[PDB]
């Protein structure tokens, strides 16, 4: 999401006027939870597509409709959000000019043009989902760092999307005439501090898992050791506990390009630790470790995890992509409460993509599962089943 504006009128303490640009189908789902019935939107389309009848005849234009919302057709798989509505009929002429009043009109959303939401019921829950991201489902977990010898991009993935949050960048070492003119080491030293500060703030650095460190040359490796040097200096145990968030990659190209060079190329990636399968894999391990030695310390399935939670034995929560994105909206509220509820009793969380072997194993298990901290026998009783 990109939010062009967002202002708070003086005549209305409550609601808001948000101009915004949805960027992917995760951002379609965001729009969904913001837009209410009886809010207004003004977007554009392309109406003038009359009779004949007198003249040819049409005209063309690019006519923008101030439509009040009545309904929605929302299909997440299909990347289709559509708002049905009636013209607000701006008799004032300032808006809605060129449209013929008295005639319903729809908005199929596109990622191309921004639109304005005149909101009535702008709440604190929507605001979270507009300025932190809005994947109450969570698909990702990544951040990258490309550096060539002269340019760097700190990249980053989202709180929701494969959507950049912060394009950092330092003064990168460029292979100077002398031994690599000392400006290299001080400036590189700066970057770590710059990237650590950004990721600490942007994130709750307990939400991202991955930093990929990517270079043409030895630069990446140099930088890793430099990270953990400064780490020992500060006694920064946020970094030192955790050899598994940095992963050291080589690429040819290193602009924003570099990332997709690294990932999709089988040089440095596969299903080993990219850290957006990280703890996802490690906890789904431990989940079957327990469950197959019939120990009562792992439990599985939408019926069974909600009951394993009622007994309040659960730590590491295993959730999926499929059961979320397969088709269904509503349903993912229930599971989100259920993550917090469970953690309010104990635990972290792992969302696994079902586009993969691991997510498929858990999906054959209703896409929801757990590991407990402690055995709580016969969690399948009270609630009736197996």
């Amino acid at each position: 999401m990109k939010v062009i504006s967002l202002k708070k009128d003086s005549f209305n303490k409550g609601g808001a006027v948000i101009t915004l640009l949805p960027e992917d189908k995760e951002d379609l789902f965001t729009v969904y939870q913001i837009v209410d019935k009886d809010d207004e939107l003004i977007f554009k389309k392309k109406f003038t597509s009359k009779l004949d009848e007198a003249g040819k005849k049409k005209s063309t234009d690019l006519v923008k409709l101030k439509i009040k919302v009545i309904s929605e057709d929302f299909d997440m798989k299909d990347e289709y959000l559509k708002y049905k509505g009636v013209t607000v009929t701006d008799e004032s002429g300032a808006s809605n000019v060129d449209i013929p009043v008295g005639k319903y009109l729809s908005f199929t959303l596109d990622y191309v043009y921004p639109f304005t939401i005149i909101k009535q019921n702008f709440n604190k829950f929507m605001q979270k989902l507009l300025n932190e991201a809005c994947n109450i489902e969570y698909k990702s977990d990544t951040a990258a760092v490309v550096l060539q010898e002269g340019i760097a991009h700190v990249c980053l993935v989202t709180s929701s999307s494969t959507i950049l949050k912060q394009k950092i960048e330092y003064s990168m070492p460029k292979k100077k005439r002398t031994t690599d003119v000392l400006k290299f080491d001080e400036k590189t030293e700066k970057f770590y501090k710059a990237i650590y500060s950004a990721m600490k703030k942007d994130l709750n650095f307990d939400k991202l898992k991955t930093i990929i460190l990517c270079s043409p040359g030895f630069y990446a490796k140099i930088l890793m050791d430099k990270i953990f040097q400064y780490a020992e200096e500060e006694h920064n145990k946020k970094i030192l506990d955790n050899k598994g968030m940095f992963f050291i990659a080589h690429c040819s190209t290193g602009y924003l390009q570099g990332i997709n060079e690294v990932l999709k190329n089988p040089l440095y990636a596969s299903k080993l630790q990219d850290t957006k399968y990280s703890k996802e894999i490690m906890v789904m391990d431990e989940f079957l470790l327990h469950l197959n030695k019939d120990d009562d310390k792992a439990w599985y399935g939408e019926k069974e995890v909600v009951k394993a939670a009622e007994y309040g034995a659960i730590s590491y929560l295993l959730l999926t992509d499929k059961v979320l994105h397969s088709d269904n909206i509503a349903q993912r509220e229930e599971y989100l409460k259920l993550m917090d509820s469970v953690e309010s009793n104990g635990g972290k969380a792992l969302v696994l993509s079902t586009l993969h072997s691991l997510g498929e194993e858990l999906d054959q298990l209703t896409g929801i599962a757990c590991i407990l901290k402690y055995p709580l026998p016969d969690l399948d009783e009270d609630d009736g089943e197996e």
């Binding site: 399935g301 939408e302 019926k303 054959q364 298990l365 209703t366 089943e385 197996e386």
Partner: protein, 608 residues
């Protein structure tokens, strides 16, 4: 894109008790969670049913089943193309059938449960194939259509019209005594009635089969080998075009099974169509012009291959793999120890084992003679020869069960013994019986590999022995003999009722324990290969069956094998690829050359 696949589920009702589990299958399945159909409960018979259409192939249900009642497999849609018949929901289904051809003999070979028996009924007109569907009220018409593209199509038109009525030699060997008494009265009556052919045929058929003694006896009275042969007689005597034999080698001895094979082949000469099913490769090779191989998991499925040559089909069988089907049907390949392979030890133990003097046992109708021989420790001796020779009598005497007419064998030794024909006569269940003999033998890993896991005795544990099956009972009995410690162990004809995999599990069993424990064993056998693997010495029996007999001292493997095979006059050169015995025809130059060398068999040994 990806290749195509399917799911097939077969459930065993014997294994399933829904009360204890609960209908857990439905509850645990992920498809049903969603509201789908994969597992449906049948309120009637009270069984779980799994539909193949809705099932995911997850296998979650299989793991959850407390017993191990459910099996889900994933196939590349190999089975779907071929569907001939299915017994019912979640039961055995048959795939393909064997071609019949006039003037020739077509073989069939496979492991038990493949549907070789079923296939015969379908060809017989006894059962009508449903076609994996509803087909039931005589819909022979649909079967021809299903067979189109196959040579069987012509046969099915013939069968419906009833131009030909096939004659069937019934398969189940255990079942026959109950069914017939007399045939009505005595075997002789059967042979006179059935004889459509020549008056010569009555005499000739009896002479070749060695039925002369048996005519006066009743069918119920007959021993297993005798029982088989009378059936064969009726299948020559009958007038017809198609003669189906289903397992004609069962119960028979080594000499007799070869004899049966020749006579059956004579039918091809009159240009009468013949079909046959065999567990024995020696027998199968001789009989057949063409051979089919039946493969697949037992009781789950079994497919018939396209027709093949005699030599070719046998070669492929032994590999354990079939290329078009691309299935490794058998988990491990069969191999025989070279004798170079064996461990080299100085053997005596206490200086040699016990020894027996000349023995004689005379019933008054049969007389057995035995030549003084010696037995040593940690050795194994095979006993071969035709039945009625007193192979059984000899073992009994050593067991102490029988008292010799002359001679004596009073040994200090503790003996364990396994009888030849096993009929239940013990009250109790299978687990109780085996536990009394020895628990702890049951704990060993060796016993898990050979007995418990393959059959699934766990399910058998509650079942009564009277209620039991033939082959399953056999492996259990052999194991039980091994259950208790003894200086010497005695086993009589372990190969009965067993298919290829089953016998070979036994071969590994006797050799390994004996070697390890440093104890001795005597094993009686008809199967060539089993004797070779286990033994170090052999005793050959000779004489005339049902009259008199003789035994010899133990002699080396090479020496004993030459004598035995010389009595048969069939040489088994060697096949270079398979290392299998390759049979040699009578009067020949190559075979003639061997007779001058004294080599009936070949192995990875030096020799010309």
């Amino acid at each position: 894109m990806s290749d195509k696949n399917s799911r097939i589920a077969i459930v065993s009702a014997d294994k399933c008790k829904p009360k204890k589990c609960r209908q857990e299958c439905k509850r645990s399945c992920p498809v049903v969670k969603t509201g789908k159909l994969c597992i449906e409960v049948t309120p009637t018979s009270k069984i779980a049913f799994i539909s193949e259409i809705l099932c995911i192939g997850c296998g979650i249900c299989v793991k959850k089943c407390p017993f191990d009642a459910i099996q889900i497999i994933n196939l590349p849609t190999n089975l779907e193309a071929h569907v001939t018949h299915r017994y019912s929901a979640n039961s055995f289904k048959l795939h393909r059938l064997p071609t019949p051809r006039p003037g020739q003999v077509l073989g069939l070979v496979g492991t038990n449960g493949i549907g070789k028996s079923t296939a015969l009924k379908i060809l017989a007109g006894k059962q009508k194939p449903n076609l994996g569907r509803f087909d039931d009220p005589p819909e022979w018409q649909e079967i021809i259509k299903y067979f189109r593209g196959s040579e069987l199509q012509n046969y099915f038109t013939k069968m419906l019209e009833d131009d030909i009525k096939a004659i069937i030699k019934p398969q189940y060997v255990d079942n026959i005594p109950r069914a017939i008494k007399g045939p009505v009265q005595k075997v002789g009556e059967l042979l006179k009635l059935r004889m459509e052919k020549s008056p010569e045929d009555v005499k000739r058929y009896i002479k070749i089969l060695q039925l002369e003694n048996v005519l006066k006896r009743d069918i119920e009275k007959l021993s297993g080998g005798e029982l088989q042969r009378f059936a064969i007689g009726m299948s020559c005597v009958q007038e017809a075009d198609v003669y189906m034999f289903d397992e004609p080698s069962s119960y028979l001895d080594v000499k007799q099974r070869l004899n049966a094979a020749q006579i059956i082949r004579s039918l091809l000469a009159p240009t009468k169509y013949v079909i046959c099913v065999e567990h024995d490769l020696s027998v199968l090779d001789y009989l057949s012009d063409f051979v089919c191989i039946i493969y697949g998991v037992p009781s789950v499925y079994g497919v018939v291959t396209l027709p093949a040559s005699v030599r070719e089909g046998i070669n492929i069988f032994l590999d354990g793999h079939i290329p078009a089907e691309n299935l490794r049907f058998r988990t491990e390949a069969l191999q025989f120890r070279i004798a170079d392979a064996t461990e080299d030890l100085q053997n005596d133990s206490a200086s040699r084992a016990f020894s027996y003097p000349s023995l004689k046992k005379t019933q008054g109708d049969f007389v057995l003679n035995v030549e003084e021989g010696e037995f040593s420790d940690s050795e194994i001796l095979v006993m071969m020869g035709e039945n009625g020779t007193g192979k059984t009598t000899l073992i009994k005497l050593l067991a102490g069960a029988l008292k010799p007419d002359e001679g004596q064998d009073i040994p200090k030794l503790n003996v364990s013994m396994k009888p030849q024909k096993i009929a239940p006569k013990f009250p109790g269940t299978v687990r109780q019986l085996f536990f009394k003999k020895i628990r702890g033998q049951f704990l060993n890993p060796q016993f898990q590999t050979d007995v418990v896991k393959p059959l699934r005795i766990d399910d058998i544990i509650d079942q009564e022995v009277q209620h039991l099956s033939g082959g399953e009972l056999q492996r259990v009995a052999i194991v039980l003999a091994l259950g208790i410690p003894a200086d010497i162990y005695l086993i009589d004809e372990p190969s009965a009722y067993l298919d290829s995999e089953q016998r070979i599990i036994c071969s590994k069993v006797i050799r390994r324990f004996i070697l390890h424990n440093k104890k001795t064993a005597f094993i009686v056998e008809h199967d060539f290969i089993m004797a070779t693997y286990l033994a170090d010495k052999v005793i050959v029996f000779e004489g005339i069956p049902s009259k008199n007999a003789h035994a010899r001292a133990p002699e080396s493997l090479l020496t004993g094998c030459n004598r035995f095979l010389k009595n048969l006059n069939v040489t088994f050169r060697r096949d270079p690829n398979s290392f299998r015995p390759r049979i040699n025809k009578l009067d020949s130059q190559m075979d003639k050359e061997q007779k001058s060398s004294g080599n009936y068999f070949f192995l990875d040994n030096t020799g010309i």
